[model samples]
Target: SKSLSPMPQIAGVTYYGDIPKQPKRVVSLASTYTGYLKKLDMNLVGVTSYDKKNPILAKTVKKAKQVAATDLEAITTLKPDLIVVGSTEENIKQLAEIAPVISIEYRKRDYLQVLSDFGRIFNKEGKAKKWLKDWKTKTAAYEKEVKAVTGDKATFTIMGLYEKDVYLFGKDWGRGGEIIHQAFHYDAPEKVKTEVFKQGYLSLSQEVLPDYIGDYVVIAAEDDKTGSALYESKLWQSIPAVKKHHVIKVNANVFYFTDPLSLEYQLETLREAILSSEN
Candidate 1:
């Protein structure tokens, strides 16, 4: 058995355990944390439905029991040695009773730091370093190419339509807003910066949609109903982007995740859409 040092204190709790050579039984309740575990090649004993259904999750979710984050009973039955959760999980104290639970706070725009932390936790620092190196190289190249296509003056905006709710996103959110404004160095309109960007996301009504429209618009819808209605509306069609074919529809399932795995794909998706836009 491989022994390890005590974990650094977190949230006023100090964890004491011999870090096993490898954690044979692990449970992850957050999709983003599951993505990290999968990328690190850790075998998970349990995960959530969102992690299981995500195509980006790939083979990471194999043989893992699907359990809700707050389902203490279901999670307890998994017999996990290490239980991972998000910062917002309501039942963290309950889940901690089952195993050494670690709450990883997620930031929509700070995936690299999260990946690094996962590397440290899983004893896979070499793998994390390699991935980060490669990601930086790919990002640099994509940034140069995308800037050439979209130009410094061109701007973009992102919106999410989930049934009756209309949400606008800033560069920090997983709605492909970061891919547009952060990774690609594109800009959002000033109105968007004040109205939505500052808050990360804003709930808006349809009447104010035109005020946030930009040089390009990327819309991610949960279903076709809202997207179809918006596209057919005179108000929607009248937007400059709509008339000029600069509006692109993206997959909600894929764009909704900002993990290391999904971000690579998101970068490509945003690139293709921007390159296809009329100059």
Candidate 2:
């Protein structure tokens, strides 16, 4: 019998009691990172609705009970021993009452570091280290190819347009921002470095948008139609990236996650986009 023992420390997380033994029943409320948890191992019994929109997640989520993350009663029915979530007041206080909740501040640390933390938490360090090593090797090769085309000084930026609003990102937000800023270690335009980097994200109207455009841009949206609103706008049309065709488009449904699994796809997409843009 595997022991169900408590892990005494997980900085900032309000852990209640015993951590599971090979955790047979785990539920994930962290929308963006459900895949990361599953990748650790698919002991998932429940996950939120956001999984349905993610092409990669749908394949695995078919088996986990789908619950609206906020509906405490529905989740209680699952009787999970562990719950994982992105940190927030909403992320904490309530859920930990249901089970020992592992709340991580999603944007506070490097994604790889977070993976390492998970390695300790759930006892998957070997898998985490393996994934990390492979990721570094692959990104190193991609960096060489991308740097050859982009040179040392050209800035990169990621922008997203949603039905309700538009946002700009730094290394923390997904939308391929981590690929451009963290993995490749590229520069951001001065304004983006000052404004977007500090805020992690910023919302701006099209009139002020040109101030954020960099040498290369990654535009992410749910569809071409939403992105085209920005793409076809007179204000956006006048931007150097649009005019020079130094831009790439990514579907929001797919590119919205920074998890190790989603990042693999994002790395390939960004590398290909940057490489293709030079043509």
Candidate 3:
């Protein structure tokens, strides 16, 4: 048996791990970010896009589910053993009544702390610690390599181009901008960085794309948004990156919004994109 700490011992209810079997059927109600789900390697039972009214993933998942507004009746129907959520947990407590609920904090920037918390949940503390150390080494190595290329003075911008709008990324948002900025040690030009602060993904319209453009543009996609069609746009074509051929279309899920499980892919993708352009 795994030595799990801080175990809650209840009379009627058994200790967390005392169950006859390890619950395999886990589901996340408001998985929120795709990275967390990817971290757990969950087979996405369902999904709800911003514009879509209903869950499109219901049909795809072996057990149909929804995000944002979870259907209590519907969720109960799926019969999940554990339900996961984050700080912005809305109905997480309610879900607890139905099954064991675990709150996974997503807002923390201290990666090690987050990993430790996650480790305890899955009885993977040691493994998670090792993973954290490995990640730092990998990130550090990539940082060193990129530094050899451009050094710490490089200035860049990461953004997501959509038909309706553009979202600018910053060093603080844990989005593509933060990763790329930190990985490549690229600053977002003094003017832009000051106005945008440490980091964020700002929303801008296509017509106003020039206002948010940067020296090296790392274009991120949320879905089909990062395709060639976006590049053909007059606004996109007008950007410096497109003209200079310094722009990159990053795969959405991992590049812009996944967790550590996908960190290597994110770093490698950015490294390839950055180095490929130079060569």
Candidate 4:
């Protein structure tokens, strides 16, 4: 399946003409992938603010300037060899003028595949393979144990509450959604397959929340509390997963990312919760 094109095995298109060799100084407006830039040990010159605060990338981004996709003037000052951005980024054409820009589509590829794609882009295929090897080795046995407890068919659903709106996610949405449904092999309720899977996440009213509750539910509360009107509802109290304490409460900051570092933390949090449900 490997072809002759010198591109990562990822979707979307990389703008600009060419960068025949590996990039020397890279700048990321994509932000989320900044951790990958660090983990891959590339020379990063610019990073988004949120990713700069990421502990794993803290040191790497210390000297790197905090920039946004709109900050074209600042980006030009850095003279980046490559710039990373989201596929639908608004300023791709302008950004391309400064340097070669590669756009990655969000949610089209799983977290592991993102790492694999970076390896190809940065010409560090060995690092990506080694990381995947180490990751698989780390979880191969643990997955089997967790699966034994969760069974192959137990349903999983990830929901988030933000500004009075509830969003239900399929496997691709973050907040442990990546590791829970992808790595752990847990299934989602039919309601999600029919409605939520299409968009990765579907925002619905609290009235129909009951229909989407699964055997195991993950609630990623933005502020890390459940003091909302929805949580106090008697109907919510009656949901099977809630009544049995099979629900997982995750902090938005902790589970919002799907990078290698974030995924590791998310995976451990999920493994602990999934196995504990057996009791």
Candidate 5:
């Protein structure tokens, strides 16, 4: 007869009984968590599928079921052994009733810490540590490359346009904003830091472009129509970046995400944009 150990506790919740050595059916509602789950190569059974598709989630989507994170029945129907979510998710108690749920406050934790947590959950500490080390190396090299082209004084901003509105992002939750400003130690225009950095996002009309525009601008657009409209607008045209042709348009799905796997690609995209301007 085999003996079973107590389940590992997370977020003050004790998972009773013998937890699977490796979960056969794992459901991830948190988009950021999907990347780490993929890194560990777990048996992903389901994931949240918002209207816009995430490039990093392509493989996972194709291999697993796609459902809204809040759909309790949809998730339960998938028969997941483990369900991953963020602490801010609503109706968590309902989801917990279906399976062993793990709620992670990803925003409260640092990148390496999150990686370490995932490593322990999946018993892949070595792989997680290796990835962290490699990520640091990649970011360091990329940052050096960027600085060479755009010096320390070069400022940038990440923004998105929807019809008549322009939304600015700060260093934390604005998709690639956090990775660009925080991880790479890049500078943002002073107004951006004061107005959007801590608040995460700010919505404004193009009339206020002067206060927010930077040396380089990354515009996240989900559709071409809005992007085209913004490009043609006089207010957008007046920005120094647009005047100098230093504006880069990135897919909203890609730019509006912050995850380990996605950040690697985002860094490359940013590097190319900065270097391209220099040439």
Candidate 6:
């Protein structure tokens, strides 16, 4: 039997024969959630979320530093053993070097697949299995909680207006408005038409988002400074959901990231947000 006991070597270090090497050093490029790094305890050396407007969302998201440029030299200086990039990162091939590169596919909410992918990358199938099980339990609980709170009956629209244009997110876009409905099992508004736009782009109008408009509205805040302004917008404030005070602002990080742990957070956080608006 493999020994479960550890052999002490130093005050802070212990060794066991054939102890599998888990990813100790990590760098997350184009990270959506700093919470992910914190969860892995990966000696998080760096993070670049690619958006500075959401600093409050990034505050608990501890990282050694944030980078604007995907400077290969800077990442090389960090000397990370593993580098995780998002699907949105444009220089996919160029960032391949300096370390092992793994692309985190966006636009899907496959948390199990995400767990398996990360487990394979880190060689921690056992750890991943345990985490995945826990996620299943928690996700189911959250689903139940959202249903109870919302009675699975509430209807709402999700719209974000910027620069006089609108970008609508459907159920397919992972973090889009569809996620909230799924959490509470709310029925979709008959049908929706979704199209792809430039990555990291936000729309400037509210009309495009009315497709999902039901009785309530929820909007994800893009940045810190603009959050209050968005609530104060004449056009936005005039919406039926906004008029009824059914409009809610949620943290974009919770909606955007796709890690197993992050998804749990998203469900829990949004459930609380929705519940708080009830009375």
Worst 10 residues of 6 by lDDT: 7-16
lDDT-wise, the better of 3 and 4 is 4
Error of 2 at 129 (Å): 0.4
TM-score of each: 0.89, 0.92, 0.72, 0.87, 0.88, 0.71
Report how far residue 268 has shifted in candidate 2, in Å: 1.0
Better of 2 and 5 by lDDT: 2
TM-score of 6: 0.71
Q: Estimate candidate 2's RMSD in Å.
A: 2.1
The TM-score ranking, best first, is 2, 1, 5, 4, 3, 6
Question: How should the candidates be ordered by lDDT, best one leading?
Answer: 2, 4, 1, 5, 3, 6
The residue-by-residue lDDT of candidate 3 on 86-132, one tens digit each, is: 55657666777756655544445343345455455555566667877
Angstrom error at residue 121, model 5: 3.0
Predicted candidate 4 versus true structure: per-residue lDDT over 1-279, tens digit per residue: 122227644575465646534676889887668777778887889888777655555555688899989999999999898888988788789999998778877866677888888787667889999988988886776678787987778898988877778889888877678777777767889998889877888988888888998788898876745436877899789898888888888866657677777667677878888777777
What is the lDDT of every predicted structure here?
0.76, 0.79, 0.57, 0.78, 0.74, 0.54
Q: How does model 1 fare in lDDT?
A: 0.76
* Stretches of candidate 3 exceeding 4 Å from the true structure: 1-23, 32-69, 104-106, 109-112, 223-230, 233-238
Model 1 vs truth, CA RMSD? 2.7
Worst 10 residues of 5 by lDDT: 1-10
153: Cα error in model 1, Å: 2.5
Q: What's the CA error at residue 48 for candidate 3, in Å?
A: 7.7
